[PDB]
Amino acid sequence: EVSHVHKVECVIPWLNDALVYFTVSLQLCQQLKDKISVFSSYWSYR
Amino acid sequence: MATVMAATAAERAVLEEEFRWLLHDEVHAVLKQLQDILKEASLRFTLKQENFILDQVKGVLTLQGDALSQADVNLKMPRLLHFAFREDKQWKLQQIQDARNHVSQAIYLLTSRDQSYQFKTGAEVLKLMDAVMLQLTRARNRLTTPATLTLPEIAASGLTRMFPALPSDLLVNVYINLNKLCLTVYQLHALQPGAVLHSPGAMFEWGSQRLEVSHVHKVECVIPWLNDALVYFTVSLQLCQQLKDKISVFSSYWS
Amino acid sequence: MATVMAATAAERAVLEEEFRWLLHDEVHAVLKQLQDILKEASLRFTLKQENFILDQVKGVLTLQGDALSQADVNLKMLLHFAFREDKQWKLQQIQDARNHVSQAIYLLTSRDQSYQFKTGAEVLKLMDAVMLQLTRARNRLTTPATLTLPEIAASGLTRMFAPALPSDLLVNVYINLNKLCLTVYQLHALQPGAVLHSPGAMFEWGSQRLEVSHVHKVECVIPWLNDALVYFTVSLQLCQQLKDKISVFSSYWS
Amino acid sequence: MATVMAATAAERAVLEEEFRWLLHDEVHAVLKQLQDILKEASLRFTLKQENFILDQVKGVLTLQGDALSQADVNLKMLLHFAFREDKQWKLQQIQDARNHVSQAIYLLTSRDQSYQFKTGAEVLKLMDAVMLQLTRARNRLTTPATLTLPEIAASGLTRMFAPALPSDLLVNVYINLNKLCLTVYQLHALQPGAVLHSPGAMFEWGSQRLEVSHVHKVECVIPWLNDALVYFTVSLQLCQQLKDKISVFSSYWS
Amino acid sequence: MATVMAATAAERAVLEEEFRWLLHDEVHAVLKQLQDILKEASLRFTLKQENFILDQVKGVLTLQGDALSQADVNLKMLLHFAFREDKQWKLQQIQDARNHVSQAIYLLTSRDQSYQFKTGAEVLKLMDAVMLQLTRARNRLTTPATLTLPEIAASGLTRMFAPALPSDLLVNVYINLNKLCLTVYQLHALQPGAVLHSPGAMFEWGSQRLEVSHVHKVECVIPWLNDALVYFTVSLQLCQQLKDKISVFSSYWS
Amino acid sequence: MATVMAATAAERAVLEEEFRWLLHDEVHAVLKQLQDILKEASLRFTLKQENFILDQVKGVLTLQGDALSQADVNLKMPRLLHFAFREDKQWKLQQIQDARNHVSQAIYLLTSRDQSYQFKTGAEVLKLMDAVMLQLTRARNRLTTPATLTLPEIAASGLTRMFPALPSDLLVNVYINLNKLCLTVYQLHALQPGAVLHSPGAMFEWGSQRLEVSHVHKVECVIPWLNDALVYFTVSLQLCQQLKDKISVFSSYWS
Amino acid sequence: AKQENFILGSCGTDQVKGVLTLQGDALSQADVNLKMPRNNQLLHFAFREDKQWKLQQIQDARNHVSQAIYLLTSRDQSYQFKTGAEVL
């Protein structure tokens, strides 16, 4: 049986950087998708 | 008594949930059917007949997909003249390209969704339906005769350049009208010392000269695969509308 | 099965209904209590002590309702002052407070006590209105900060004393929450804003520039003002309690 | 040029992202601190002094948690009173306060500390909930104004004294923010409302009409109540600070 | 009849127009007054007394603006302390308050006084902004509750005394609304949170665990802080009055 | 001066009130007219002609209300075959039932209101109008040719079972198109080792076999009472729209 | 420079403290002090030989990153797209 639980933690700066990069990239992708959909809904991409 | 009310509330909650699953299955069924129909509609725009014969002015046009690959025209005057393209050249009909784009977008809207999520209110389905229907109605609308094409725009069109090379008493326009490939010849008349009418007696300026439409000759021919495509659009629109209506009935029923 | 479910909507709906009747009775109980308390608060303002004695300045003021009917003041600088004729200086704070009380009571008595309880937002609006009136009355009773020394000078009170008084003295009488306050400002013009009310404050008056050299403040508790304030506090709490219960109810069944 | 602009959306988006991680860490830091402080505040209410001595009336009260286990009172009118058996009178204010604390702590411990910060409106809602619980606890600890003399009479406390006591006396024990309060109301029925709690207040009880002739009030500071209140104040300020920082952030990047 | 009705829209519209010009003049009057008062409040923070004397601990502090330039302290435990060099400890509360004042004044002076009165919601927004700045200044001046003993220890002030001082003493200097406050915490580490600031409070510092054994608090009124606070209160009331009049107007003609 | 402004304000208040009564009377007038027209439209769906003769394929159909009581069909092949129902059986046309339901609902919307209340803003009238118009437009839409009927749905329809009993090289469909009773015969062709087109060359699966439509024969005949009903729908829709527009003009006029 | 040693926990607030050396996805060291079971005792543990503890989360994430980059780089960046749907 678990009697006690001890949890310690630390920010990992480069992991944090990675997450930030993932999020920002996701945002770039969605913005591009939105522009493409907006344009394409009326005009042809080519 | 609280036990009655709780067991009870569980009974209504169960019925509503089961109905939510029914509606889930209905939604995805209709969506799948939409992808099938719309992909067939898509297949109609790319390669079926290619040569078409179009009154008192006659024409043989070879149309491959969206490209009017050739256009051979005979005009019977009070006198007959005969025209053709540069042999090497193709005139693209923008309406078909546009329509094909809208179809492509609709199909993307249908295939870029996870067909595996649990059912919700429906407002999201409603938005999907609106998007798809907008694309379909736009495709159909583009296929229809554009009213806002001026005679100077027709003159400035590449099609005039595309013919033996011919005078400035004649303008030639080829367009699509729903389910019909259309050839129109405008016979003109320079005037002695707007542009929207397209009827005999319409006036406009071109180049640096002022011109009047003297006569208009209109011939047309049904394009079978365009007709199939339009039929597909209509059916898809109705399927979408039916799904929207059922979702509304459901949502109002349990609220 | 649909019969189970119909029985079920019925029993839930019955419980909720009965609870709305409970809340109905509670609302009107509280409202009636509010009218009682507020009418007593009202009775404090109309007509109980009238003479009041207010350590280097002392004064005897006769206050009748909102009217300061007499003010006999002794100042050690001993010089002595009184009112002329039988004239009364009205303390506007009391008038204003009485007005807010009157309005609250109107809000309570001009309503249909055959309410057949609806939702509660209407009750909530009523509660807000009444509470606004009460809090405003109490706020007015409190010492007004935004009174300038030139406004004090331009007040009729300065004109009001017998013998006719000097331009090195200003007299102000006001109410601070629940105690009659008498303040004497001793000035003297300087050789060749107005908000601080403290020694060393400067301001203009008439066509001359003056500085407050010191300030004398005496005060005395007014029992019926205290009663009124207690009534305001209790009424506010009753209102708040009703609002909170209504919110709990409405969130409970929604 | 589009490449410049893409680089540009990238750098702005990176800065904003990093700042959201900062705000993420700040939020959880504050939340953890709130749980610590509030759990200590909670520990003050459960089980530290138990015997308390409360100038013309004096009393010795033994208070265990929310239960007034004994109350031995001497009154100069000298007469002497005590509890019967080993019975305890519960002070509901403490119970209520403890409930609000319990709720706040639940609000803090029943949340996912793997938040991956979103916007802040959710944090803001949490902050509002907790602050409401704290402010309510503190408000309850404060002297309730809306307690009528007949409610005091109908309270079990009157029944609770040994020897069995007279109908010219009422006894009330309550908590005012942080100090145990004992009040004795001396009455006497008149010959052929209820809210003021002051000498000269009139009310009905049983089938007889009574008037408060005078009131005796003694009080004593309760150290752990004071600790709890200090905790409430500090927690409220921490919450407010977090709300304000979130608002600054959200307005800054919007 | 339409002529009657046209005349009629004309007369109503004229009355409402004239009243908007009245409200226009009132708004700008109040605004100008606010700039005057707030600029004086501002003048209190920049440069008037500088030396202050703050019953078992006593101290002489020289405070210049926001900078505590010197602090000579005597403690009975008699031991004596002072600053090193000619260094100044800045009291951040004063800096913050001065910032809020600066912002309020900007809000007032960066606006077009050729307003041609519109509706009032814009005025209301301005009033809200200014009032927020004032209330924040005042709140900051008040004693911060959320300061932990380890934060006090980590403060530069502990490092700041000559002779270099012991680890059984902590010194904190802060401002509480309007009076310079000096507090000495007497500690002693125990044998093998931090928020209460009272005797018997426990916390960690460095790598050791410490408990506050007792606390000594002395304070002294700062006259110009008091003036500033009075200014804040008056400004807040002026703002509130303007808001209320605007609301009455807008509800009156709607 | 306040007396001027008050008497004055009373003058405008009086004019606006009187106009509100005018609009009240107009609203109820239009509503009554709607009940009359719609009840006549309703009466058209229940009992007028019952026998109908419907190109190169011919038919005599007996239609009673919503029930196709009999359908006698001659098909002229390259060779003629003759078909009839079980004599005893009736095929119900769902479009008519649906339309009749919408009409019933519209009439309920009109008759279940107190024709005696004082006039208000109109938003309530606007909602009533929207409801009624939705019912009418739905009735009309249902009467129209349903596009979303697949060939396998036609095969799975009871109508096929209803005929002497006939092969699986023939499918028979009877439906309504606005103002025309329609009979369509699909001539099929099993294929050697979607379904939406309804045109020659369309493919689909049925039973456990794969089939292709080889030819399509379409005949139709006007149904007089359906035409009357449709005319009624159109007129009612216009009456509703006119009332909506007038109410909007009023409400914008006095705001 | 990129950080390799990380401090988890404090001496006073926690009963566990650790200095973990994390290299890429690999936990190369975990040097841990535990103040258990009593508040004056302390036990000590640390990695054994030159071992790598793989944090699977980091490896997986890195794989997905690689795949995304592949999707972007497995294209002729002089490739004109045909429809908008292809880009989507």
Residue numbers in the entry:
A (entry chain A): 240 to 285
B (entry chain D), F (entry chain D): 1 to 47, 57 to 63, 69 to 93, 97 to 180, 182 to 211, 222 to 283
C (entry chain C), D (entry chain C), E (entry chain C): 1 to 47, 57 to 63, 69 to 91, 97 to 211, 222 to 283
G (entry chain A): 56 to 143
The authors write:
Rogdi is the human homolog of Drosophila melanogaster rogdi, and is a predicted leucine zipper protein of unknown function. The human Rogdi protein comprises 287 residues, and is highly conserved among species including fish, fly, frog, worm, and mouse. The crystal structure shows that Rogdi resembles a boomerang with an elongated curved structure comprising two distinct α and β domains. The α domain consists of four helices (H1 to H3, and H6) that form a left-handed four-helix bundle through van der Waals interactions.
